[PDB]
Paper text:
Members of the family Birnaviridae possess bi-segmented double-stranded RNA (dsRNA) genomes and form virions with non-enveloped single-shelled icosahedral capsids. From sequence analysis it was proposed that the RdRPs of Birnaviridae possess a non-canonical active site where the polymerase sequence motifs are re-ordered C-A-B, motif C containing ADN in place of the conserved GDD catalytic residues. An additional unusual feature of birnavirus RdRPs is their ability to self-guanylylate: auto-catalyzing the covalent addition of a GMP moiety to a serine residue of the polymerase in a template-independent manner to form VP1pG. We have cloned, expressed and solved the structure of the RdRP VP1 from IPNV in both its apo form and bound to a catalytic metal (magnesium).
Clear electron density connects the helix with residue 31 of an adjacent molecule in the crystal in 7 of the 8 molecules present in the asymmetric unit. In addition, residues 3–10 are seen in this structure extending toward the catalytic active site. As in the high-resolution structures, the helix formed by residues 13–19 lies in a hydrophobic pocket within the active site cleft formed by loops of the fingers domain and the N-terminal extension. Residues 11–12 form a short isolated β strand which interacts with residue 241 of the fingers domain, while residue 10 spans the two sides of the active site cleft. Residues 7–10 interact with a loop between residues 594–598 of the thumb, this loop being partly mobile and modeled as having two conformations in the refined structure. Residues 3–6 interact with the thumb, the palm and the C-terminal extension, the side chain of F5 being buried in a hydrophobic pocket between the side chains of residues W563, L578, R582 and F662. While the conformation of S2 (the first residue of mature VP1 assuming removal of the initiator methionine by methionine aminopeptidase) could not be assigned unambiguously, it will clearly lie extremely close to the catalytic residues of the active site. The observed self-interaction brings the N-terminal residue of VP1 (S2, assuming removal of the initiator methionine) within approximately 5 Å of the catalytic site, and removal of the N-terminal tail or mutation of S2 to alanine abolishes the ability of VP1 to form covalent RNA∶polymerase complexes. Instead, we propose that residue S2 at the N-terminus of VP1 represents the site of covalent attachment of RNA product to the polymerase.
Residue numbers in the entry: 3 to 792
Write the structure that this text describes.
């Protein structure tokens, strides 16, 4: 026995403990990340950490124990549903004689003790990329491989840690109260009417459909159930059935608690309305607020993201999981308006990017606007929640509010409520599409329920600094804050984003922000993108292959998208920003959709979806990534065909299972991705003429620049409409005045004969009584005080 293939001889100690200590490291494959043990994973350690860092911990409040009530007694409008056996005959409500302190313990995965399939990097793809690189002469191949391996080695998809969540809360407090403490719109210098005039341009809205119910009813009254499928309708917002119910139902989904949410939402709105018109509105309103304190406390859910391994315990984004009744009531105000307001820069003369999709010509419409602005030597601004985009001095600037939500004051949300109730919930005659009860909830209570309220982590009831990220108004409040920053930029004579004059806008507004991207020589970059467009492959000559040499991309990072010029379509098309593309390839999310995960059909289809989606979003233009992902999806498809396993239904309706499912609803993945798929996703319904875009619904002819100029002159301090004047006065008057405020609104709300004249007289009357400083107190402060009572 001579020349036998060597086998590793090791000590019995090594053998016993299965040690790889001696073994040669395969630098081609990164080791799995194992999160450290978390020292802040106990209520004692977490509370001490927060105390040491001067973070406010509230005196804990208790929720009454659950009591069973008859569904038909609690929800009389749904008696028929109970009778038809379609709805449970009992509801579990917090009306007990005893009470409990709520506890929320979220799961953080992976963790020190569990490094499993959740958050696993795509090592199979890494191996496929490696092998395809050996077999193919792709000039961009080595860089693609390096990038995917580096993302696997440095990032981690998962739900962070308690330390990450706690450190994140500190960062939010610092944004809100630290270097640049928050400022209410009034402190900055804006009245609710002045802000509404800016929002008419930055966030154009339409009124809800005339057939949509006004804000006059208890939520359950918007449910019409008879049994007749043709007439059965809910006029309420839609909900994510598998999402958390929030307080007072920890561990339950919205699906398990819809009847309970309706009972609680009905009760809160009913009690509030009665209290407001009672003999003592202050005592009654404060009692209702205290009784339903839990409707203002969000479960501090750790957000799943592709975090950096080194900053695993330094930063974990949180989702402020709003109580289902609060969510329902807030959504009743925002959704009917927003559903009718998908107005953005591609379809309306507005800087708004609300409802934007880069697909179906969207990216090309943006590129046309960018090119025209560059040609006409004009500045350009675009706004999307906490994202600001500025085109000035042949440069594309991406400005993001620093931890956006943390900059929010209840007054910012109150101004948004004013905008929605004046511009949205209004009839053609100027009369309100709401009653005093709804104006009370919307204007006086709602902003202090989700802004500067509280959250729950473990058994700790913690202060929330700013607005709760994930609440129904997150986008709207963030968009209003960006509007203030942009308005201040215009006022300051449009200082370049790289200057101190631009950075000084942080103090002027009390809103923290940072320049995230500076894309220099824009005009030249766009020219290069067109010139370098390949003649070969997908969207070039139409063949089902990636280009040998991909063209230059205009790296706008416009809501995560870059632009590529297509010779076949003679237009710019979106491709997911490189860094996001690589991170999604390295750390794919799993089947993260309800019970869907238990459906073998969905689980199986997902494995194909996962690779098809990575190709669709931009992988198609990365020769190595397209080659490997195509191979993998085809292999999976072939196994199914050979085995006779049908998942076509899940492949057709794939959108629900992919982080990329948005907008791409009309595309099907039952057939493999081809050049047609790419043509289809990029096909516009209509040709584009920027000059043909309709102007904003309100103040059409006016631009944001014109409105800013008017505001600096002291214009729009007060609305002309008496109905609107009453709503602005509502923001200044203390809760004890609610019964009298209800009387001032009743004529316009009831649309009585001569309501307009009556309202004018009542508004002037109210205006006079507001000369008494004793009557002047923010109901938002009164709400917070009542919510925090023990
Ligand atoms: K701030």
């Amino acid at each position: 026995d001579i020349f036998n293939s060597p086998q590793n001889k090791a000590s019995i100690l090594t053998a016993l403990m299965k040690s790889t200590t001696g073994d040669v490291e395969d630098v081609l494959i990164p080791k799995r990340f194992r999160p450290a043990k978390d020292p802040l994973d106990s209520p004692q350690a977490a509370a001490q950490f927060l105390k040491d860092n001067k973070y406010r911990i509230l005196r804990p409040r208790a929720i009454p124990t659950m009591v069973e009530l008859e569904t038909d007694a609690a929800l009389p409008r749904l008696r028929q549903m109970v009778e038809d056996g379609k709805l449970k005959d009992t509801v579990s409500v917090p009306e007990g004689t005893t009470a409990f302190y709520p506890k929320y313990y979220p799961f953080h995965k992976p963790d020190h003790d569990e490094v499993g399939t959740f958050g696993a990097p795509d090592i199979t793809l890494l191996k496929q990329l490696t092998f395809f690189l050996l077999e193919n002469d792709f000039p961009t191949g080595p860089e693609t491989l390096r990038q995917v391996r580096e993302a696997i080695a440095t990032l981690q998809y998962g739900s962070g840690s308690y330390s990450g969540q706690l450190n994140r809360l500190l960062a939010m407090k610092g944004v809100a109260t630290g270097r640049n403490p928050n400022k209410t719109p009034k402190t900055v210098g804006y009245t609710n009417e002045q802000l509404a005039k800016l929002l008419e341009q930055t966030l154009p809205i339409n009124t809800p459909k005339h057939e949509d119910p006004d804000l006059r009813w208890a939520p359950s009254w918007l449910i019409n159930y008879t049994g007749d499928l043709s007439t059965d309708k809910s006029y309420l917002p839609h909900v994510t059935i598998k999402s958390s119910a929030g307080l007072p139902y920890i561990g339950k989904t919205k699906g398990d608690t819809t009847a309970e949410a309706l009972v609680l939402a009905d009760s809160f709105i009913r009690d509030l309305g009665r209290a407001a018109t009672s003999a003592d509105p202050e005592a009654g309103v404060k009692k209702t607020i205290t009784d339903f304190w839990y409707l203002s406390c969000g479960l501090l859910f750790p957000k799943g993201e592709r975090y950096t391994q080194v900053d695993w315990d330094k930063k974990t984004r949180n989702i402020w999981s709003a109580p289902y009744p609060t969510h329902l009531l807030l959504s009743m105000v925002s959704t009917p308006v927003m559903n009718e307001s998908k107005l953005n820069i591609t379809n309306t003369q507005t800087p708004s990017l609300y409802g934007f999709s880069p697909f179906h010509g969207g990216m090309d419409r943006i590129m046309t606007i960018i090119r025209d602005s560059l040609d006409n030597d004009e500045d350009l601004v675009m706004i999307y929640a906490d994202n600001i985009y500025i085109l000035q001095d042949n440069t594309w600037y991406s400005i993001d509010l620093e931890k956006g939500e943390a900059n929010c004051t209840p007054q910012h949300m109150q101004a948004m409520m004013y905008y929605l109730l004046t511009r949205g919930w209004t009839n053609e005659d100027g009369s309100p599409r709401y009653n005093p009860t709804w104006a009370t909830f919307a204007m006086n209570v709602a902003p202090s329920m989700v802004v500067d309220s509280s959250c729950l982590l473990m058994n700790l009831q913690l202060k929330t600094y700013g607005q709760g990220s994930g609440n129904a108004f997150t986008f709207l409040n963030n968009h209003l804050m960006s509007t203030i920053v942009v308005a201040e930029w215009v006022k300051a004579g449009k200082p370049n984003p790289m200057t101190k004059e631009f950075m000084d806008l942080e103090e002027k507004t009390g809103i923290n922000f940072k320049i995230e991207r500076e894309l220099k020589n824009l005009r030249e970059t766009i020219v290069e993108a067109v010139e370098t467009a390949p003649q070969d492959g997908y969207l070039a000559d139409g063949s089902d292959l990636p280009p040998i040499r991909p063209g230059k991309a205009v790296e706008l990072d416009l809501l995560g998208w870059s632009a590529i010029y297509s010779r076949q379509m003679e237009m710019f098309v979106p491709v997911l920003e490189n860094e996001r593309l690589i991170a999604s390839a390295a750390y794919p999310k799993g089947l993260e959709n309800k019970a869907l995960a238990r459906k073998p059909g969905a689980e199986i289809a997902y494995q194909i979806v996962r690779y098809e989606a990575i190709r669709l979003v931009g992988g198609w233009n990365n020769p190595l990534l397209e080659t490997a992902a195509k191979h993998m999806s085809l292999d999976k498809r072939k196994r199914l065909e050979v085995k006779g396993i049908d998942v076509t239904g899940f492949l057709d309706d794939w959108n629900n299972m992919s982080e990329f499912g948005g907008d791409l609803e009309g595309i099907t993945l039952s057939e493999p991705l081809t050049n047609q798929t790419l043509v289809d996703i990029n096909t516009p319904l209509d040709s584009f003429d920027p000059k043909a875009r309709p102007q904003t619904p309100r103040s059409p002819k006016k631009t944001l620049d014109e409105v800013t100029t008017a505001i600096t002159s002291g214009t729009y301090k007060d609305p002309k409409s008496a109905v609107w004047r009453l709503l602005d006065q509502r923001t200044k008057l203390r809760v004890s005045t609610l019964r009298d405020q209800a009387l001032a609104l009743k004529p316009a709300s009831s649309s009585v004969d001569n309501w307009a004249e009556a309202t004018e007289e009542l508004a002037q009357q109210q205006q006079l009584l507001m000369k008494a400083n004793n009557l002047l107190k923010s109901s938002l402060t009164e709400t917070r005080e009542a919510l925090e009572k023990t």
